[PDB]
């Protein structure tokens, strides 16, 4: 339901979580907590960026941050991040991940005009 | 469906039109005449070979409007034909009540048109008030019970006309055009501030739905039509809104009903205890009919039922719900996107009825 | 008064200030793309007014510049007085009885001026739309012919592109009196209401909850209110309760999630509720750790949500038996209940 | 989820079925089929009137007829009946039932103003 595209043990953002279809990964957060705990430290603390494009479309709430304290994602700390404020390297690594998995877009809520508006 | 109450019919053409409707439809005229009493109106009685006798009661409102009653005869199905013929007499984009303001007018060029229009057997104009800055007249007709309010604001030079566009409207508008060289007034429908959006009229929206359903239009269930027409009444206003998911609600709801009806007609009843999870699978990203049901249908039927159920499930999944992380819930902030999704939904609905 | 984005005529602005005491003219100093005029004030020092020309055909007046600049309010006020006060800042005007063969010659007879050139847009079968531009005065009027009804709609500010297109239409299809209409609309009918009116209504109806609204919830509610406050004549109104029910489904989930009750998809709300007679009530295992107010708001919220959504968000296999709402007072009864519930979900 | 209010009301009209809450009886039409075949003949043929007030409110589609052939409600035969075409004895027994079982109205989608506007 999700794919971890980037991991930073010591970075501001400890992980980047991308949706792989029309389902919202934030309904699966407990799974995301354990997989991150397998990829990073068991009880990691920091911020997690979520890209929800395939569930949300190319909308103003496509990118959302949430805090993670002692390996638990805190759901009442969600802050919507504007695309102009997300670092460009994360953006292009998400673009690459989509381009290598057209089946994500096939399973998405995106329209054809959306799919070739973000594959510019 | 349609509303036949308080129509702005040209009262002086109701008999003629009705008869000419029975002249082209080649039905047999049986009776015309006013209603017995206490109800000032008109009644038409006709029939086709081998069906019951249809009666249509056209009552004359004190507004100057008219109300058609076709749910009264021994054949309402065919009475509605005369009702709809009379309904289509009116431009559906014309206003029920017109407020129109023109520029560059003095009293000396407006009283002559008022007087000359009141040079008819049923027209008469009264001076309502003289404020010495805005002078207002009322034009009433004793034959068609409809009146118009004409207010000229003098230091502004602005002539404003309010009322139903029925009899004195028509005569004054055209007389004013014919004397003061205003040749297009009969052709300007709307002129207002650009950023103000108005809900489109039900009949205009319905006509668009027909042009969208095409052949899949005579088959629409009446609740599905009321939903899709309501949605269009808003969609066609192109309003400036923070979010447009609401505008897709009619399409998704209609898809569920139409899909459920078709599946029932094909031996696949969708109950509440079971749902759509006992008639579909999801291999990866499309939903597909289970093999025991696909084995009895042809590719086309399977392709439309699965495409409908996939679209309905994929879109409904977040548009009819919200996340616990509330701000991550799916929104649509762009009208073009909304309309894309809606035209898709319309093709799915059309095929559900047609295939 | 407001002196910004004035619909002043693009030409005729040099000669526009010559009837007071005309005197020294000139364009605006530096990268301003406008004009800034200094002239002798009556028996006084020199006065200057800076009027800059915006990207579209609008002019903006600046008299707050200093050095005896309040005499610039004189040029500001005659610029106030130059354009018709009753005319709209942006016009939408639709006419009936036009085909493509009647509309293209107007566009190509109105695109042979000094710097006036039109452009073709989308060519759909639903309604054709054109884009008349001007390459001297920075104006663009967008002109659509709706194909099915033959309706010619023209939208934009009354500057040059609009003026010349209107004159060419009034002169080649004998509609010349059209210069005299200012308004033609439905009497007594309400427009779809602006976002900010809808927002202040939401704020006084959210009470102590408004600062706490999730952004998605506020955007849904404000959309619904833009249409609710127009008092619209619809054959059905169920669509107008979509924002309330979805927002409830969002607020309840969050509140319950923070109260130690994570609402999942496999389970649902059902896991924490009982339905003895007609209301759902939090189960004792869950109610035992909350205060009574919280029990009541959560249970009342779930009960309304479930009763109304059961038929409003679904349809029956009969189709013509699905729940409908054909009355605006009925819809508003539900919506005002929902606003109380949403507010209390946040505030309790 | 439903209540049979009258049986063999007319020759043509074999039963009257009224919703007892917000759930729509026509989604559980098999249950009604079994109850009708127990109260009437095993395979009855005729018309069934449905009063959906507590699921549909006092709306224009409150009353619907469906054909019943060989004991089965045929779902593609639904025709909306206006209240003024429903016989008064059927109407008054439906009203009596509502006043005699106020919990049906409690379980309904009606508002209080609706609750008394049809009483009444």
Curated annotation (Swiss-Prot), chains A, D:
Induction: Not repressed by IscR. rnlA-rnlB forms an operon, the downstream rnlB also has its own promoter. The keyword Zinc-finger does not apply. Disulfide bonds: none annotated. Probably degraded by CplXP and Lon proteases. Transmembrane segments: none annotated. Disruption phenotype: Essential, it cannot be deleted unless rnlA is also disrupted. GO terms for biological process: regulation of DNA-templated transcription; regulation of growth; single-species biofilm formation. InterPro entries: RnlB/LsoB_antitoxin. It comes from the Bacteria. GO terms for cellular component: toxin-antitoxin complex. Keywords: Toxin-antitoxin system. Antitoxin component of a type II toxin-antitoxin (TA) system. A labile antitoxin (half-life of 2.1 minutes) that inhibits the endonuclease activity of cognate toxin RnlA but not that of non-cognate toxin LsoA. Can form a complex with cognate toxin RnlA. This is Antitoxin RnlB. It comes from Escherichia coli (strain K12). The gene is rnlB.
UniProtKB/Swiss-Prot annotation, chain B:
GO terms for cellular component: cytoplasm; toxin-antitoxin complex. Its EC number is 3.1.-.-. One of its GO terms (molecular function) is RNA endonuclease activity. Gene3D superfamilies: 6.10.250.2650, Bacterial toxin RNase RnlA/LsoA, C-terminal Dmd-binding domain, Bacterial toxin RNase RnlA/LsoA, N repeated domain, Bacterial toxin RNase RnlA/LsoA, N-terminal domain. The keyword Cytoplasm applies. Keywords: Antiviral defense, Cytoplasm, Endonuclease, Hydrolase, Nuclease, Toxin-antitoxin system. One of its GO terms (biological process) is single-species biofilm formation. Disulfide bonds: none annotated. Its main location: cytoplasm. It is found in: Cytoplasm. It is an enzyme of class 3 (hydrolase). Induction: Repressed by IscR. rnlA-rnlB forms an operon, the downstream rnlB also has its own promoter. The keyword Transmembrane helix does not apply. Disruption phenotype: Not essential, slightly smaller colonies on minimal agar plates at 30 degrees Celsius. Strongly reduces RNase LS activity, restores growth of an enterobacteria phage T4 dmd mutant. Altered mRNA half-life for some cellular transcripts, including an increased half-life for an internal fragment of 23S rRNA. Allele rnlA2 is due to a premature stop codon at residue 33. Sensitive to high concentrations of NaCl, sensitivity is eliminated in a crp or cyaA deletion mutant. Increased levels of Crp and thus increased levels of cAMP. It comes from the Bacteria. InterPro entries: RnlA/LsoA-toxin_DBD, RnlA_toxin_N, RnlA_toxin_NRD. Toxic component of a type II toxin-antitoxin (TA) system. A stable (half-life 27.6 minutes) endoribonuclease that in the absence of cognate antitoxin RnlB causes generalized RNA degradation. Degrades late enterobacteria phage T4 mRNAs, protecting the host against T4 reproduction. Activity is inhibited by cognate antitoxin RnlB and by enterobacteria phage T4 protein Dmd. Targets cyaA mRNA. Forms homodimer in solution. Forms a complex with cognate antitoxin RnlB and with enterobacteria phage T4 antitoxin Dmd. This is mRNA endoribonuclease toxin LS. It comes from Escherichia coli (strain K12).
UniProtKB/Swiss-Prot annotation, chain C:
Its main location: cytoplasm. Disruption phenotype: Not essential, slightly smaller colonies on minimal agar plates at 30 degrees Celsius. Strongly reduces RNase LS activity, restores growth of an enterobacteria phage T4 dmd mutant. Altered mRNA half-life for some cellular transcripts, including an increased half-life for an internal fragment of 23S rRNA. Allele rnlA2 is due to a premature stop codon at residue 33. Sensitive to high concentrations of NaCl, sensitivity is eliminated in a crp or cyaA deletion mutant. Increased levels of Crp and thus increased levels of cAMP. InterPro entries: RnlA/LsoA-toxin_DBD, RnlA_toxin_N, RnlA_toxin_NRD. CDD domains: RNLA_N_1, RNLA_N_2. GO terms for biological process: defense response to virus; mRNA catabolic process; regulation of DNA-templated transcription; regulation of growth; single-species biofilm formation. The keyword Cytoplasm applies. One of its GO terms (cellular component) is toxin-antitoxin complex. Keywords: Antiviral defense, Cytoplasm, Endonuclease, Hydrolase, Nuclease, Toxin-antitoxin system. Induction: Repressed by IscR. rnlA-rnlB forms an operon, the downstream rnlB also has its own promoter. Its EC number is 3.1.-.-. Composed of 3 domains, the NTD (N-terminal domain, residues 1-90), NRD (N-repeated domain, residues 91-197) and DBD (Dmd-binding domain, residues 198-357). The DBD is responsible for dimerization, growth inhibition upon overexpression and recognition of T4 antitoxin Dmd (via residues 327-357) and antitoxin RnlB and subcellular location. Forms homodimer in solution. Forms a complex with cognate antitoxin RnlB and with enterobacteria phage T4 antitoxin Dmd. This is mRNA endoribonuclease toxin LS. The lineage of its organism: Bacteria, Pseudomonadati, Pseudomonadota, Gammaproteobacteria, Enterobacterales. The gene is rnlA.
């Amino acid at each position: 339901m999700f794919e971890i595209t980037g991991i930073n043990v010591s970075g501001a953002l400890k992980a980047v979580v991308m949706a792989t279809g029309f389902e919202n990964p934030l309904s699966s957060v407990n799974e995301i907590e354990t997989k991150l705990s397998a990829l990073l430290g068991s009880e990691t603390t920091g911020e997690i960026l979520f890209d929800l494009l395939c569930a949300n479309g190319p909308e103003w709430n496509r990118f959302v941050t949430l805090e993670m304290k002692y390996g638990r994602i805190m759901l009442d700390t969600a802050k919507i991040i504007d695309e102009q404020d997300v670092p460009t390297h994360i953006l292009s690594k998400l673009t690459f991940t989509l381009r290598n998995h057209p089946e994500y877009l096939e399973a998405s809520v995106l329209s054809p005009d959306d799919v070739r508006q973000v594959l510019s | 469906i349609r509303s036949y109450k308080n129509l702005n019919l040209v009262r002086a053409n109701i008999e003629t039109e009705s008869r000419q409707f029975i002249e082209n439809k080649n039905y047999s005229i049986q009776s015309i005449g006013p209603m017995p009493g206490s109800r000032a109106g008109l009644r038409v009685v006709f029939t086709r070979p081998g069906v019951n006798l249809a009666t249509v009661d056209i009552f004359y409102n004190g507004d100057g409007s008219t109300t058609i009653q076709y749910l009264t005869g021994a054949n309402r199905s065919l009475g509605q034909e005369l009702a709809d013929h009379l309904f289509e007499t009116i431009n559906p984009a014309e206003f029920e009540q017109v407020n129109m303001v023109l520029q560059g007018f003095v009293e000396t060029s407006v009283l002559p048109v008022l007087e000359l229009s009141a040079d008819e057997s049923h027209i008469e104009f009264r001076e309502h008030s003289r404020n010495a800055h805005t002078v207002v007249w009322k034009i009433i007709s004793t034959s068609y019970q409809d009146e118009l309010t004409v207010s000229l604001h003098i230091t502004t030079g602005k002539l404003q006309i309010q009322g139903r566009p029925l009899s004195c409207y028509r005569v004054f508008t055209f007389n004013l055009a014919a004397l003061l060289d205003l040749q297009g007034l009969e052709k300007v429908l709307i002129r207002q501030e650009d950023g103000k959006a108005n809900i489109v009229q039900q009949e205009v929206a319905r006509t668009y739905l027909q042009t969208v359903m095409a052949d899949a239009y005579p088959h629409l269930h009446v609740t599905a039509e009321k939903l899709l027409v309501s949605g269009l009444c808003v969609k066609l206003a192109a309003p400036d809104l923070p979010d447009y998911c609401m505008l897709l609600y009619p399409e998704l709801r209609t898809i569920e009903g139409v899909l459920k009806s078709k599946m029932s007609g094909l031996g696949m009843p969708v109950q509440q205890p079971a749902g759509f999870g006992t008639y579909f699978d999801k291999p990866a990203a499309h939903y597909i009919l289970k093999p025991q049901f696909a084995a009895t249908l042809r590719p086309e039927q399977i392709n439309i039922i699965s495409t409908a159920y996939t679209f309905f499930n994929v879109e409904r999944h977040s548009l009819f719900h919200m996340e616990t992380v509330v701000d991550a819930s799916r929104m649509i902030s762009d009208m073009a996107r909304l309309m894309g999704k809606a035209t898709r939904a319309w093709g799915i609905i059309k095929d559900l009825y047609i295939v």
